[PDB]
Amino acid sequence: MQQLINSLFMEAFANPWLAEQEDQARLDLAQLVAEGDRLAFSTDSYVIDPLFFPGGNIGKLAICGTANDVAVSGAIPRYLSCGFILEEGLPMETLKAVVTSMAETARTAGIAIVTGDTKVVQRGAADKLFINTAGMGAIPTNIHWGAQTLTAGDILLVSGTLGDHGATILNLREQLGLDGELVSDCAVLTPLIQTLRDIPGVKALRDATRGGVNAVVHEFAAACGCGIEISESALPVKPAVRGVCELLGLDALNFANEGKLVIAVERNAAEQVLAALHSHPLGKDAALIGEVVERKGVRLAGLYGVKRTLDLPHAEPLPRIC
Amino acid sequence: MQQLINSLFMEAFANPWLAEQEDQARLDLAQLVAEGDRLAFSTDSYVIDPLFFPGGNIGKLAICGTANDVAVSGAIPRYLSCGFILEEGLPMETLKAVVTSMAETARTAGIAIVTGDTKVVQRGAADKLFINTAGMGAIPTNIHWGAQTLTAGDILLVSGTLGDHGATILNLREQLGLDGELVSDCAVLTPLIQTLRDIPGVKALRDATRGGVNAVVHEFAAACGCGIEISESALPVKPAVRGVCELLGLDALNFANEGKLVIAVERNAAEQVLAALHSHPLGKDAALIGEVVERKGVRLAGLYGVKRTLDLPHAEPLPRIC
């Protein structure tokens, strides 16, 4: 019932902003402005099927994805909101596991869930559980990361292996026989991103969820009016993900990630940035993958250095991967 | 494609924050701090069935509800996020109508939709359309509205008639035979609330959505450690809503409102506050309904001044009223 669900929310997420709260949380603005001059603000909804998977669950994901959307601006995520849409009859055991994981993930990341909402719909009106989170943090005045700034000669990096999350979910949903080898990379990336905070050569940073790295590179190119060239052989792809690629013929560049950055840097900063990423556990597999060029468009270099236009796909590999 | 949906979003909601955006909106903190010392931050999900109804729709509702949750703090709402969950095959005519109403409601209220998300699920996995919005605004330093401040002697008012929204949806969903008599009160309340901004004796404001006025007075009582006594005869209830009460035996105090305030005021300010409310189109039916008292608990005064404990109901009158 509604009262048990509300009690679960309040107990699990309990903090000084949520307690004694009325219709809204009330956040100290002086504290935020002391951290930075801009407030980063993002929202995402989470409709992943299944709810639980190797490496995470919808609840952990709902904190990670939104914390990362904030964190890639250079801001430390501090406050999140949470809206649950529940299907009547969802086992309490399942809801409790999701909420427990959300609360733990937020607690570990130093994030407070300061406000929320729960709606219950009848059986069949929603598939089990959907979550929306919105988040905020203050962007330090000296950090100016954006793709509009990119110019010919800039280097493109990824913080780790590509397509782990997408491949994990595809394997589960389509029963591809790789259970035990694939794991989601779902993680809060703030500690990794903060290694880059004082490095002058860092120019743009984005996480690569829906649409994977392919979407990001196309977004980067559209923003700066320059082209981007990616080396296919330079792409770090785990053996189990390669296995999914082989079976389905689908691109690891198109697979959603839930713990990876695409980073654009000044040419002379590339080795310094790689070293910073390699020093942190979340950046251990970071690699150079490409370059910003004068010639517009996105190209992938295959065999014998042949550069071919890299198209965006028409749809995601499968519905509800995130 | 769902790039049709993303195009609808960007076109309808277009503003400087949404354009050339990467993973997050970026909001000027100095401007917020100059307005107030606290940031009000709220979120609500909207799962109303049906999507369109007399007096509004899910889109207008998604703006109103979240704007109101911010505005009851004293803050002027400035920025909203918007997360859509869409069922595959939802007619574009429906979605366009929803988005248009959202855009027009936001524009009229001077609210910018600065960031968002869309997720699409398969047929049967969600009932047509769900929306989450989160919103923010700065609370002026000199406004200290809070339920915790209430003391014995304070007067309770409502800003209009009770249960119009809930009753409208109940009549539609349960086919009670009152079509054309009932209309939802869905409205952005900021202009009404701002009549009270400079009135010294205003102590607490809440909107009265889920659980209605009954939930608000219970929340007030819990926050301040004082009791609340309500006059049953003083409750303003329209004839058609009374008709729903008569048919179902259900209480207008429990029915959801989507354009009503419950206001607590210093005893001496009651006449001034009532006149201020009556001066605005949205507060014409405002009324005194009770008082805060020393004896703890919530009581309803019936025939012959008999005061009886007013219990909260176990469930909402029906799922998906909001």
Among A127, A207, A322, whose Cβ lies nearest the Cβ of B23?
Answer: A207
Question: Quick one: residue A74, left, alpha or beta (phi over 0 = left, psi -120 to 50 = alpha)?
Answer: left
What's A6's domain CATH number? 3.30.1330.10
A 208-247 residues with CB < 8 A to B: 219, 223
A63, B89, B315 from B216: Cα distances, Å: 30, 39, 15
Burial tier of A175 (Cβ tally within 10 Å: 0-12, 13-18, 19+): exposed
- Assess whether B189 and B280 both reside in one domain: yes
Q: How many domains does chain A have?
A: 2
- Assess whether A139 and A249 both reside in one domain: no
Distance of CA A71 to the CA centre of its chain: 10
- Assess whether B136 and B255 both reside in one domain: no
Q: Please enumerate in sequence order all residues whose Cβ is within 8 A of that of A34, keeping only pairs 6 or more positions apart, or say none.
A: none
Per the structure block, which two tokens stand in for B161? Answer: 């008639």
Cβ distance of B127 and A125 shorter than 8 Å: yes
- Assess whether A10 and A131 both reside in one domain: yes
Q: What is the spatial distance between Cα B44 and Cα B64, in angstroms, rounded to a whole number?
A: 10
A214, B6, B14, B307 from B99: Cα distances, Å: 29, 11, 12, 47
Cβ distance of A36 and B42 shorter than 8 Å: no
Bridge pairing between strands B112-121 and B79-87? parallel
Judge whether B235 and B289 are in contact, CB under 8 Å.
Answer: yes
Residues of A with CB below 8 A from B37's CB? 28-30
Is the C-alpha dihedral spanning A278, A80, A216, A239 positive or negative? positive
Per the structure block, which two tokens stand in for B216? Answer: 């608000």
- Assess whether A124 and A168 both reside in one domain: no
Residues of B with CB below 8 A from A119's CB? 45-47, 130, 320, 322
- Please name the amino acid found at residue B263: I
Sheet holding B112-121, edge to edge: A25-28, B38-46, B129-139, B79-87, B112-121
- Assess whether A150 and A42 both reside in one domain: no
Judge whether A15 and A79 are in contact, CB under 8 Å.
Answer: no
- Assess whether B182 and B274 both reside in one domain: yes
Judge whether A131 and A150 are in contact, CB under 8 Å.
Answer: no
Among B40, B83, B117, whose Cβ lies nearest the Cβ of A24?
Answer: B40
Phi, psi of A149 (to 5 degrees): -85, -10
Q: What is the spatial distance between Cα A38 and Cα A137, in angstroms, rounded to a whole number?
A: 8
Among A2, A29, A148, whose Cβ lies nearest the Cβ of B33?
Answer: A29
Residues of B with CB below 8 A from A2's CB? 315-316
Judge whether B127 and B84 are in contact, CB under 8 Å.
Answer: no
Q: What is the spatial distance between Cα A181 and Cα B107, in angstroms, rounded to a whole number?
A: 51
Per the structure block, which two tokens stand in for B87? Answer: 């069922």
SS3 annotation, chain A: CHHHHHHHHHHHHCCCCCCCCCCCEEEEHHHHHHHCCEEEEEEEEECCCCCEECCEEHHHHHHHHHHHHHHCCCCCCCEEEEEEEEECCCCHHHHHHHHHHHHHHHHHCCCEEEEEEEEEECCCCECCEEEEEEEEEEECCCCCCCHHHCCCCCEEEECCCCCHHHHHHHHHHHCCCCCCCCCCCCCCCHHHHHCCCCCCCEEEEEECCCCHHHHHHHHHHHHHCCEEEEECCCCCCCHHHHHHHHHHCCCCCCCCCCCCEEEEECHHHHHHHHHHHHCCHHHCCCEEEEEEECCCCEEEECHHHCEEECCCCCCCCCCCCC
- Assess whether B131 and B210 both reside in one domain: no
What's B161's domain CATH number? 3.90.650.10
Domain ends where: B100, B124, B144?
A: B144
- Assess whether B94 and B218 both reside in one domain: no
- State the residue range of the domain holding B139: 1-144
Per the structure block, which two tokens stand in for A81? Answer: 């909101």
Cβ distance of A41 and B26 shorter than 8 Å: yes
Domain ends where: A128, A144, A160?
A: A144
| Three-state secondary-structure class, residue B276 | helix
Q: What resolution in angstroms, rounded to 1 decimal?
A: 2.0
- Assess whether A137 and A189 both reside in one domain: no
Q: What is the spatial distance between Cα B228 and Cα B218, in angstroms, rounded to a whole number?
A: 8
- Test mutation, A6, A13, A20, A22, chain B, max B CBs within 10 A: A22
DSSP state at residue B182: -
- Assess whether B165 and B117 both reside in one domain: no
Q: Please give the torsion angle defined by the CA atoms of residues B288, B293, B298 and B299, in that order, rounded to the nearest 10 degrees.
A: -70
Give the count of beta carbons closer than 10 Å to the beta carbon of residue B205. Answer: 27
Phi, psi of B60 (to 5 degrees): -55, -45
Per the structure block, which two tokens stand in for A98? Answer: 């999701």
B191, B208, B313 from B203: Cα distances, Å: 18, 16, 27
| Three-state secondary-structure class, residue B136 | strand
Among A23, A83, A116, whose Cβ lies nearest the Cβ of B72?
Answer: A23
- Assess whether A135 and A152 both reside in one domain: no
Sheet holding A202-207, edge to edge: A202-207, A261-265, A155-158, A287-293, A227-231, A298-301, A307-309
Could you tell me which chain B residue has the CA closest to the CA of A216?
Answer: B22
The maximal CA–CA distance of chain B, rounded, in angstroms, is 66
A40, A53, A89, A259 from A242: Cα distances, Å: 36, 19, 39, 18
Domain ends where: A119, A144, A169?
A: A144
DSSP state at residue B282: T
Judge whether A114 and A79 are in contact, CB under 8 Å.
Answer: yes
Q: What is the spatial distance between Cα B184 and Cα B20, in angstroms, rounded to a whole number?
A: 37
